[PDB]
Structures are given as structure tokens and as C-alpha cells.
Design a protein around this ligand. Structure first.
Ligand SMILES: Nc1ncnc2c1ncn2[C@@H]1O[C@H](COP(=O)(O)OP(=O)(O)NP(=O)(O)O)[C@@H](O)[C@H]1O
Ligand SMILES: Nc1ncnc2c1ncn2[C@@H]1O[C@H](COP(=O)(O)OP(=O)(O)NP(=O)(O)O)[C@@H](O)[C@H]1O
Ligand SMILES: Nc1ncnc2c1ncn2[C@@H]1O[C@H](COP(=O)(O)OP(=O)(O)NP(=O)(O)O)[C@@H](O)[C@H]1O
Ligand SMILES: Nc1ncnc2c1ncn2[C@@H]1O[C@H](COP(=O)(O)OP(=O)(O)NP(=O)(O)O)[C@@H](O)[C@H]1O
Ligand SMILES: [Mg+2]
Ligand SMILES: [Mg+2]
Ligand SMILES: [Mg+2]
Ligand SMILES: [Mg+2]
Lengths: 288, 287, 288, 288, 287, 288
């Protein structure tokens, strides 16, 4: 039974490896430092981003999809399960154009009439780099995976953003969905590793209800992550955002690398500030 | 061969339609709900929920009363779990700052001293309130038509459907988890077309994994009963929390779990229930 | 399709409602406060009574039976599945004459030979307000209900006490009796709501075995109720009895309203003390 | 479906009940007070006795079997699973005769030669009141129950002492023996209730390993009991002994009534002192 | 018809036999074990156990060495998990206060400077030690005969059977839980008849329900591996406990779980393992 | 039946034993102390290495491979089931030349074009001491073992590293893979003990999710080891790596000997620090 290769006979294979074997790919936008401790997002890697409900996850991720899909011309696949395509389409446009397009009826009215809409649409979806999952109607694990599968190998997406991994909708008849979040994870990491696609997954936090928490600051710990630490093991990197909406600097958010397989370099990456005007998470200078 | 994954480039018209079609009907009981939501829009679907017996119906009723009184709007009430007379009693009582139900003396009183009629007209005078009537299990389409009649027939501005778990429809298809989802689409659809403000109530899953709801514990979008089809079709989501086994049982924390329009979520503010007047008064608090 | 009424057109129906519509009914004996928070027990309602093991449940419930069956003269149907009718019959007599008949061989021998037994027997059971299920030989759900329903409809009972709802004894061949308790609740609630009878039910608590517990004080919580929270919903009022048997005042008991649908007024009702001499649950003046 | 009896029609049944319905039976020996709070051991009752390993359980119980089987001529059934018949036979003899017969080769030698053995044997096993389970070899639940069953209904024992309910030995192939201790319990209480036999069961304590414990004093709490509180609910009374072998008065032991269904009277019963000479647990006067 | 329940009256003779047939062989390493047990009696069956790798074999070996040296007794050693040479090494080393095994230098030393032979005779001179030999799975009866030969053939006073889980016998009967029980009866029986002191070692069940053994945690009679047939047939039961992840890893608590003879149980006392000499020295301690 | 030897008659066998009997062997690199407590790794022994997720297991183990394969020139068989041979090949090269080759696209491109790649490749893999299992395509137990055995017996490896023992992939159709891990252990231990090879195996930890954990410091305990304590017995030495990635010194790691059969010397071995520049686990001077 021989499948036992001696290191000597791997010379070429290894050489072929070192050349065009990327260790730095897809850098995050909005806070160098995330990049310092992670060296970006490698293909085949599963990237986890979390935070207190409504503190940065969504915006942050949505911004990465934007930069990757624009300035760096990558094919971005979007799977925003809790919202409609036009809705997320709307967010991107406003965001790209640094305007709270949704939070303003006046503006939506304007651009549609003065014609700026069409301008903005082509200026963003012009190079056909964005592709989304359409439905809203509960997607099943394999059902979903099949579609992400299509996005990767079919439309050739470089990145897939799955927003919210609690919306499972699968094989109902097996206690505690904990097993679900885990099996799903396994299928995601497996899907990622083999296709080589960068996979950014969002998940929520357990409600600590034992101290003072999240919405009020309080660092998020690897244990806090929803779903029984199956993702704490299946995901290669873990970005967490922390901020105190009920404090002094509600828009000051701290980025913490809870985990990073590739580099092993963990800890506080840096900070960012939410600009209510532009609706962006701008880079910041701070230290507490 | 493909299957349901659209490209952004092909969303042009769809996005355009979406973009076209600011502040209407501000809730009562706690400013801030408005701060974070700017009130309720026609066509929009409001979702109010909380633990069992924490004030879901109460909150919704207070809204009905202010909207159908102060802001002269035609309200449609569909409380599938209580007699019309019952809901009427609550409205009549609330309107007069008294817990008519918790008082057999007061009820007797107002009926004998003649005040009932006074109160009854002083409230139901302008003909702004209308209700569904039964307690005898209502079917989806059955109910919807009726809600549709209230909007088109009687011309209501708001429609309150208390409790969206009382489905009662096409039985034979497993896990009513889809019922809740299908109905919600029919509800969201109906709301959007007619442009009526729709406030709906749904229960929460029993976490039974920690210390829960009736004992504080913030509610999260995941907790919502019914397989999150509603955390979707519904535009705004309010959540009422309180710790009845605590020091301030009447103190309730309002939490905006979702506001499609303003996207502004989090804690709206605090309110206290007035055991006397039975009103949800805005409170002064911070934890 | 028209079944939509207008508030105005309901004037008479509402008028009819506001009078002879009972909101207050059958006050609990033992502590004013249970009444302040619950306004008593309404027909068609399901009262759930619980506590630690051997802490007072049955006695609390049996007191409500004696006072309702006597002073407020109502037909009480008793279904004490863990005790013989003559035994429950025995407690009622003792209680009615303020003596712990059972804890005394001398008093029993007495009342039997001095002829006081017949006196008390008449002076109590006379008005034929008491009726009981009979067996000890495991009863089935429908079997039981049928009997209950007979008490309500056949004999015309205003109140039905069902001591202990974990003694199911039914359609064995379906995993975890967790579903049994839940399906039983639904039937009880339904039964109660439709017939209009006052339904007082007792149930056990989950053994916390994760801290210090119940018999040693420790407030019970809705989560503690045995049976997967089917009853924490179907039942209208939940009365929890607490006390610390290994403390300075073992007989001192805290009454907690875990839930009151009607009033929504929850929390600590007040305290009671057990009179080891009369066996009565007397109200108490106390504060911790 | 009528099995619904009205209290009025139970007059005779009830009368027949009150007379020759014992509430005080089999009082404990060695510490009045246990009797004050429990009124003894009623037939059909399941009595639980526990303590730190080697602190009183065995001796205490062994003494009750002795008094009940002697001075009060009751038929005592013994099931000492961790020891041989001759061995427990030996203990009783020595104990009855207030001498550490086992802890003394000199004495065993004497009585056998000087003939006092035969004297002591007849003076104790004379009235044929003692019957034991024989084996040592792991007994199975139903296997055991069958034999206890025999002791009760066959030899007509008034009391059965089952020493140690952790030695289960039954239906191996079902996770966590926790279910075992519980099912067994259920079968014991069921066996007890129906035959009317007094059942004294011994069980050990969970090792707290979170504080300072048992062998060093520390009151035993109902939660501490081995086996998932199935016995905390199935047993009618619970006697616990506490003492500090590593303290000042190692032989001073406190008796605590952790539970008592019949009376509801819980708390510290009283104390006793171990006399290394007589090997008995003598009554004491103390207060800490 | 009856079944195995005897009455006290019929135990007369049996009790008599039992009553007929004080201090022999006192353990080494911690007085108190003796205080609570008065040593080991012939015919008696001693049971030593503890967590995995906490010093079961070590303790037993120290006993073998003191008994076969200081108290000139013939010891039979049956360490089914180690070569004769290995156990011999331990004895030789212990006898000279050195951890021969943890030293490749010392081993080399004593062999070259000639000390090995000196030590070897100085110890195995009086011909008091004898061992089983293999590592090749031994069968119950197979092993017993051999133990029987050591007692009758070579005339040993003590017999050490290290590890009673290495059964290796009549395979085909489920749960080796009975094997352990049957063997134990054969062992207890053999001990009682011949009157040889038998020290046996058995493992513990892995509690995996709390914080366990290697981390402190007193061991209880229930923990004993093998369905408590041994907590029965064995007359005395010693238990060694220590917290290797603590401050005093070498500090071990000896606990008498059972002493049929004295009935005196509980904590015997404390000992410390001498990383240098490799001896279990009595310690001064109290918690 | 005679197979009973006398100590005396063994003199020569013992003499032969005491010399050329190796007790010290293959010292671990990274921290003296692992060696003080374990005396290195003996052939025929099973070394178990573990820690939190992405905390250093693989790296620790891979260092032992490089030093044993080089400096102490032994045949090392690598079975990294979660990484490509060229990838493990890549880490060994980088490590050997004290550079984090993988975390640098610039260094890779360099060594490839300046010809240093071939130099390093030879200067390392030259002596043919390194050999690896090859796939990523799930390996079966026997399948794997067979391969392992080939490395030991066929190629003559002194050490066999098997990274990760939760990747089972075998006879699916039998509940909880808890039995799989245990049966696998037995085979490994057996394999090791019989062939005499040094077997270093890695395994995961159970997610404590009951306090603050592992990645955040928190000493691991034998109970934490994943896989039902089959390995906590079959394996000879258990090395646990601890560190707090969200602290002041993330790269500082505490080495804990969870168990050492040979020496019985357990506890904290000492500390190590990860050199982010050379990627080497260097010893550290520290004390908490
Ligand atoms: N003590 C340390 N401090 C900081 N980085 C480290 C440390 N030890 C290793 N690393 C680096 O962290 C990364 C992951 O380490 P590695 O040992 O490969 O992970 P692992 O624990 O095997 N992963 P997993 O299989 O996911 O648990 C590598 O780049 C290592 O070089
Ligand atoms: N925040 C509050 N504090 C105290 N009492 C309240 C509060 N809100 C409502 N109540 C009262 O509690 C009772 C039940 O409230 P209601 O909103 O009718 O229940 P619900 O949640 O609709 N019930 P259910 O359908 O059983 O969940 C009524 O008497 C209310 O007036
Ligand atoms: N607060 C109290 N303090 C002291 N004794 C009490 C108290 N309440 C009841 N008792 C007595 O305690 C005994 C047991 O009470 P009872 O309510 O019958 O038990 P229970 O809780 O129904 N038992 P179980 O079904 O085993 O939980 C009776 O003799 C009661 O009279
Ligand atoms: N109390 C102790 N403290 C520290 N080391 C000890 C102690 N007792 C024994 N040791 C040493 O620990 C190692 C293993 O002891 P040993 O008694 O041989 O293991 P064991 O328990 O028989 N092993 P196993 O069969 O695997 O359970 C030897 O080097 C002993 O000298
Ligand atoms: Mg309601
Ligand atoms: Mg009861
Ligand atoms: Mg050993
Ligand atoms: Mg690894």
C-alpha cells in the first residue's frame, strides 16, 4: 500500500508550488492592521465576521464586497439571505456613492428623476462583477450550497459573501440546530477549500446576559460565537467588531482578530469610525 | 444549467422600480421608537413581539387607540384571541385611563351611573374603529379577504392582526413553519399593494437554554417564532422586554430589531406600565 | 365575505358584556396578594401550582378546595392521583376542624369512638360539594379527562383539582414523555376553556442540580417547571411556592406569581406560614 | 365513564380508614427528635439514609434493624449487598452485645471456646426475626426486587434494609446509570407502596470537591445525593448524618431530616455520639 | 417457591466457622495505613488502585521490597505489564535509593564500575523474590496456577498481581465485567485457602463528569473499575490520590476505602514521592 | 505449569538489560523542561500533542520533525492529513532556513529565481530523512495505518508524526465517532509498541463553552481532550500547549505535561516564545 512519497521526489512539485502560491490576496479595506495580522483573505479560506447585533458586521462586510468588486476588479458573489436583491443592490449604490440612499426619500426621488441613478448603476455594476442569490424564501443547506457552488464555478466569483449563518432551513427532524450550524459549516469549509473561493461568512453573538454586553462595548470572545464552536474550528480567520453605541464614541469601533490560522497573529488589529454621513466605516487613529 | 442567481447588471429595472416609492403615524408610549423608525409607513409591515404575557397586545392596542383618536385614522382590529366586546372594553377603558377589566365595581358603576354610553360615544363616535369577529378559527385567505375588505371596503389606514400563529389553513402539509412563511408573504404583499399600515404580532421561540424572556433577556431576530420568513417580509420589528420577577416588572425595554427604512436599530428607550391607568408611559431610565 | 363588525354597532353587545362579566372570582385562601395579583381564579382558566418536593403543593391546593367547597360553597371535584379518597377525605376533615388528624393516632381513635367523626363528616361533606376520582391504579389521559369532564358536566363542578400532571399513563410507544405532558396540557386547557370550569393543576420542578436548590429556598423560575414549557404557555396562572426547610423559619413560605395572563401582574405575591398545630396555611407579615 | 365517587358515599370507607390507619409506626432508636420530626417510619414508605463515606449511615441503619428486630419484635429483612451473611451476622451479634467483635480476634476466639457465642446467637436470632439476602455476587434489579418481594410477602418482613443503592447490576446497554438509579428507585417505591413494607435504603453522596466536605463536617444538602434526584422525589423521608472525623468531636454526629413527606417537618433533628467501645451511636446532648 | 434468601437462624454453623480465624506485615511509606488496618493478614486480599500513572505499581513495589528485605518474607511478583528485568531494575534501584530507570548514566555506571553485581546480590541474595514471566497474555486459571505454584511451590508469603484487567480468558461472553468478578472470586478463594497475603491492583472508571483523578478528586468505592465484585471479595482497599497539575504533585493522599478487619476507613495519611530516591516517604500535612 | 523465574536466575538478563536499554531519547526542541519531565520520546511510545484551535500544535510537532530529521538525523515519516506535502515541504524548508517562507510572496519569488530554492532543498531533504503520506483525500484507518506501517517497516522511520486524529474516515454506519477515535488509538498504541517507532499524534480539545477558554489562556485538562478518554490512557505522554492570544504576550506559550507514563513527572514543563521572524518556537524565561 504505497502512497508514501519521499520529500526528495517532490522537488518540482514543491517548486511549482512556491511560484504562484499566493499568501497575500484580497486585502481588507478600511483599516490596515487587519491586513497586518492576517495578510488578507486567501482563496479557499473561510472568513468569519461578527459583532453585537447592529454594530459593524454587515457594514464592514458590505464594504469589503464593494472594494473587492470595484477598485480591485474581483468577481463578488452576494448571498444576503435577510434582504432582497434590489435592497442590497440599493445599499451598495448608496454606499459606493457615500450617501445614505435608503435613509433618504428625497435623494431616491432625485437620482431617479435627474437621471443620476442610471449613472451610478453603470458606474458600479458596469463591469459585471456582482452576482446575488435571489429569494428571501428560506433556503436549505444543500439548496444554498448548490447556488454558491454555481456562483463560484459557474460565474467564476472570487469571493462569496454569505450574510447570516443562522438562517439554516434544512432537514427538520433532528434536535438542537447546533448540529445544523456545525454540519453547514463543515460543508462550507469543504466547499471553500476545494473550489478555492474566498468565503466571508457572517454570524451573530450569544447573548451573554451575565455582565454588561456588546451593545455597550465589552470585547467579544471566541466562546461568545453563536453555534457550538464548530465554526470556531472550521473558519480560518475571525474578525470581530466592538463598539459602545451607549457610550461616548458610539461610532468608534475596534477590530479584533479572534482567530487567524494562516498567520497565528491574533489580538486587536486597530480601529475605525462610523461616519453617519457617508455611512462608511472610515479608518481611525485611537488607543484606549 | 443555472437556477435562481441573478447578476447585478440585470437588476436595473427592478432596482429602479424599487427606488421610487417619509414620516407618518408616530407610535405612542415612547418617543425614540420614532427617533429610530420615524413612525410607520403605508405599505410597510410592522412586527411587534415579546415573551408570553409581557404586553404585546397591550402595546399594539395603545397604538390603535392613539391612531384612531388623536390622529383621526380608520383602524382595523383583528384580535383572533379575544371577543370584539373584549377588545372594545380595553379601548374604552384605555381611552378613559382606567383598567375596566380589572374592576367589577367600575364596570358595574359606569353601566349604572350611565357613563358607559358617554364613554362609548366619546370614543366610537367618529366611526374610526372596526373589528373582525368570531374566535372561530379563521383561514388564511378567509382572514386576508376580510382584512382586504377593511382596507378597501371600510377604508382603514391601519390594520392590526393580533397573533400570526393562529393560522388555521390547508392542513396536511408538515411543519406549519411554511404556513407562517406563506401567510407572511400574502400579508407583506397585501400591505404593499393597498398601502395600508399593517401591524402584526407573533410569538417567540422558547429558548429553554439559559435564563429567559419573562426574566429579562434581550430578544434577538433569531428568537422570532416562525422560521424567519417574517424577520424578512416585515419592514419594522419592535421587541418588548421586561423582567417580571425583578424590581421594576412594569419597566419595559423597547428594542428595534429591524427598520428597513432607517436601518437604525438597537434600544429605542424605556416605558413603564401604569397599573392604574393601564397606559404604557415613557420612562426615564438607563442600565 | 363580511364578518367585520363596526365598534359602533356593538354598543349593546358591549353593554351586555360589561355587566355580568366576571373578572374577579374564587379568591385563593392563604395569603391576600395572590388575589391582589391575580384577582382570583376565573372559570375557563388553568391554574398551575408547583414547588419543590414535599414542600406544600398538595396542601396549598387542598386548602383552596376546602374553602371553595365550604365558605364559598362550590362543587369541587378532586382528582388526587397519588392518594386514596379516604386519605384526601381524611385531610379535608382534619383541615375543616383545624386539626392535623393524620399526624395523630390519639385524635383518630377519639373522633371514632366519641362519635365526633360522624358529626364532622356531616358538618363538612353534608352539602354534597365534594366529589373525587377513585383508584390509584394508573389513569389514562382520555380516560381521566372523561372522568374530569363528567365531574364538570355530569356533577356540575365549578372547580376541578388535578394533583400532579406527570402521572400520565398513556399510549406508551412514543419517545420522551415530554410530548405526553404537552399534549395533556392542550387537552386540559381546551377542556377548561370550553366547559368554563376552574382548573387547578399541580406539576413538579426540574431538579436544578446546578447550585443550591428549592427545598433550601431558591426562587423557582418558569424554566424550572417540569415538562417542556408547554404548560408555561397553555396555563393561565402559575403559582410557585417557595420556602427553605433547612432554615430558621422552615414553615415560612414565599408565594410567587410566575405568570398571570389576565392581569399581567407578576412577581412576589406575599408570604404565608404553616401552622403546625392547625395545619392551615395562614397569611404572614414578613419582608426580606 | 363513572369512577367518580362523591365524598358523602365514603363515610364507612373513611371510618374504616381512620381506625387502624397508623400514622406512628416503627420509631427510630438512638435519638428522639428524628421521631419528633418524622413520627417514625410508616409502612409503604421509602426511608433514605445517607452521609459521608464511613460516617454513620451503616451503623445507624444497622442499629435500627437491631432495635426493630429485638425489643419491638418486627420481622427484619436484610440485604447487605457489599458484605456476606456471616459478616453482617457477625456485626449484629457484636453490636447487640455492645462489643467490637470484628475488631478483636481475642474476643471472637473467646466466645467460640467459652461457649458464649451460642448464647449470644440464640439471644438474638432466637425469635427468628432476621432474614438476609445471600450472594455478594452482583444482583440485578428485578432479580433483587424479586427476593425483597419474597422477604416481604413470603417471610412476612415488616422492614427491609437495602444497604447501598449504587450496586445496580442491570440491563447493561443504556448510557449513564443515572437512569438506572432512577428506574430502580421507581420500582422500589412502587414495591413499597403496594406491599406496605417499610423500606430503608442507603445511598452515598456526590463528592462536592468544591469547598471543604463531608469527612470534615459540612452539612449534606438534598442536591448532594448520588443518583439524579429521582430518589429525592421517590423517597418519603431522608435522614442524613453529619460529622467531622478530622475535627474536635469526631464522634459527635448530627442528624438532619433533609426530607419528610408525611410531616413536612424538616431540619436538624438532633445529635448522637459514636462510642468506640460499644461501637454504637449513643444519644447525645449538644448544640453548635 | 423461594430462591437464595437465608434466615439468620440457619446461619449458626456458617457463622461459627466464620468466627474462628492479629497483626502481620505492616506497610511502608506511611504509618497510619497500619493504624487504620493493622497491616495485612494472610488469606486476606489487599486492593490498591488510583488514577492512571499516579503510583499504584510504585506503592505496591515499595511494599514488595520492604517485605522481602526488612521482614524477610518470600514475595511473588506478577507484573503482567512489564518485563521481569524491568521490575527487577525498580527493586534494585529502590533498594539503593536511586531512580535507576531515569538514568542512563547511572545504569552505565553501575555496570562498568562493577556495582551492579554488588547491589544485585545484596538484594536478591536471600532468594526472597520470584516473578511471573512473559508479557504474552496470561489466562485466568493459567495465571492462578502459577500464583498457586509461587505460594505452594516456592512458598511465598506475599503475592503481588499488578493489574487485574489484563484478563485474557474464555472470550465469547459479553462485558468482561463478569471476568473481573469471576477472577476476583478465584483470587479471594485462593488467598483464603492457602493463607498467602495477596495484593492486587485494579484501575478506576473514568468519571468524565466533573474534575477528575489526575487532578485530585477523592476516589470512592463506586469508582473502582470492574463491576464492584472486587469492592467485595477484597478485604482491604487502599486508594492513592494526588493532583499532578497542582503545587504538590508528589504529595499523595492515601485513603482506606475498606478494611474488613478493622472497619476503620477514611484518610490514612500523607506521603511525598522523592524524585531523587524514588521512595514514597511519609509526609507531614493536613488540608 | 512453570514459567515462574527467580530474581537470582535473572542476573544476566538484567545485566544485559541495564546496558543498551534506552530510557532517554529524542529530546523535544523548543523548551528544556519538556525533557526534564519526560526524558524525551522513547521508541514504542505514543506522544499526544494538543492545544486550542490554531494555537501551535502543528507547528510544535513540525519543529520536532525538523530537528529530529536534521540535527539528530533520524528518518521522519510525516502524515499531515490537513495539508499538501508541498505545503508541509514548504514549512520545513522555511523553518530550516529560519524564515517564514509561507508568509512572504517576495521571499518565495526570490528563492525560486535566485536559485536558492534548490540549495535549501538539497541542504535539507538531501539525506533522505523526510517522507510523507500523500492525498488530502480522506484516508481510512487500516488504510492509513498500513501506510504508516510502511513508513516504519518499509522505509525505516524512527518517528511517525500523525497530525490530527479526528480525521478518521472509516466504516461509517456506527453511532458517535467516539468509538472510532478509541479504536484508532488502540491500533496506534499497538502499532507503536510492537514496531518500536516513536509515534507523535495530535488531537483537538472539547470546546469548554463554560467559562473563558483556551485561545484566551486557561489551562487545558485531561478531561478537555477530544475523543472520549481512550487516548488519555493509551497514549504515554500528553503535551498541552497553552497561550492567551488576546493578551499582552500572545506568542508566549506554557507547556504542560498532562501525563508521562515513563517518569510520572507531570505539571508545567516551562515556557516558550514564538519568534514571528524566524517562526521558531524558542525557549523562554518567564514565571507567573
Ligand atoms: N505561540 C505562537 N504564537 C504566535 N503564532 C504562532 C505560535 N505557534 C504557532 N504560530 C503560528 O500560527 C499559525 C498556526 O499554527 P499551527 O500550529 O500551524 O496551527 P494548528 O494549531 O496546527 N491549527 P489547527 O489545526 O487549525 O488547530 C502558523 O503560521 C504558526 O507559525
Ligand atoms: N409592560 C407591562 N407590565 C405589566 N403588565 C403589562 C404590561 N404590558 C401589558 N400588561 C398587562 O398584562 C396583561 C396581558 O397583556 P397582553 O398584551 O394582553 O398579553 P399578550 O402578550 O397579548 N398575551 P399572550 O397572547 O398570552 O401572549 C394585561 O392585563 C395587560 O394590561
Ligand atoms: N409550609 C409548610 N411548612 C411545613 N410543613 C408544611 C408546609 N406546607 C405543608 N406542610 C406539610 O408537609 C407535608 C407534605 O405536604 P404536601 O403539600 O402534602 O406535599 P406535596 O408537596 O404535595 N408532596 P409531593 O407530591 O411529594 O411533592 C404535609 O404534612 C403538610 O401538612
Ligand atoms: N506519588 C507519585 N508522584 C510522582 N511520581 C510518582 C508517584 N508514584 C509513582 N510515581 C512515578 O510515576 C511513574 C509511573 O508510576 P507507576 O506506579 O509505575 O504507574 P502505574 O500507575 O502502575 N501505571 P499504569 O499501569 O499506566 O496506570 C514511575 O516513574 C513512578 O516512580
Ligand atoms: Mg395576546
Ligand atoms: Mg403531592
Ligand atoms: Mg502499572
Ligand atoms: Mg493543524
Amino acid at each position: 500500500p504505497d502512497g508514501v512519497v519521499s520529500a526528495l521526489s517532490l522537488r518540482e512539485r514543491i517548486r511549482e508550488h512556491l511560484s504562484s502560491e499566493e499568501s497575500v490576496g484580497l486585502l481588507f479595506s478600511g483599516c490596515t492592521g487587519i491586513n497586518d495580522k492576517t495578510l488578507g483573505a486567501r482563496g479557499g479560506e473561510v472568513i468569519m465576521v461578527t459583532s453585537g447585533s447592529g454594530m459593524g458586521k454587515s457594514t464592514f462586510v458590505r464594504q469589503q464586497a464593494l472594494q473587492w468588486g470595484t477598485a480591485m476588479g474581483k468577481k463578488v458573489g452576494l448571498a444576503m439571505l435577510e434582504e432582497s436583491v434590489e435592497e442590497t443592490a440599493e445599499d451598495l449604490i448608496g454606499l459606493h456613492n457615500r450617501v445614505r440612499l435608503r435613509q433618504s426619500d428625497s435623494l431616491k426621488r432625485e437620482i431617479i428623476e435627474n437621471g443620476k441613478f442610471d449613472q451610478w448603476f453603470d458606474e458600479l455594476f458596469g463591469n459585471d462583477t456582482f452576482h446575488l442569490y435571489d429569494s428571501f424564501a428560506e433556503a436549505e443547506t444543500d439548496r444554498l450550497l448548490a447556488k454558491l457552488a454555481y456562483m463560484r464555478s459557474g460565474l467564476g466569483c472570487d469571493v462569496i459573501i454569505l450574510d447570516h449563518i443562522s438562517i439554516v432551513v434544512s432537514a427538520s427532524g433532528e434536535s438542537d440546530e447546533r448540529k445544523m450550524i456545525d454540519n453547514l459549516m463543515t460543508k462550507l469549509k469543504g466547499f471553500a477549500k476545494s473550489t478555492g473561493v474566498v468565503l466571508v461568512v457572517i454570524c451573530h453573538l450569544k447573548n451573554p446576559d451575565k455582565g454588561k454586553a456588546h451593545e455597550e462595548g465589552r470585547p467579544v470572545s471566541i466562546t461568545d460565537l453563536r453555534g457550538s464552536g464548530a465554526l470556531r474550528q472550521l473558519s480560518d480567520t475571525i474578525i470581530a467588531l466592538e463598539r459602545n453605541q451607549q457610550g461616548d464614541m458610539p461610532n468608534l469601533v475596534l477590530v479584533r482578530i479572534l482567530k487567524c490560522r494562516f498567520t497565528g497573529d491574533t489580538g486587536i488589529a486597530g480601529y475605525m469610525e462610523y461616519n453617519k454621513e457617508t455611512g462608511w466605516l472610515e479608518p481611525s487613529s485611537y488607543s484606549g
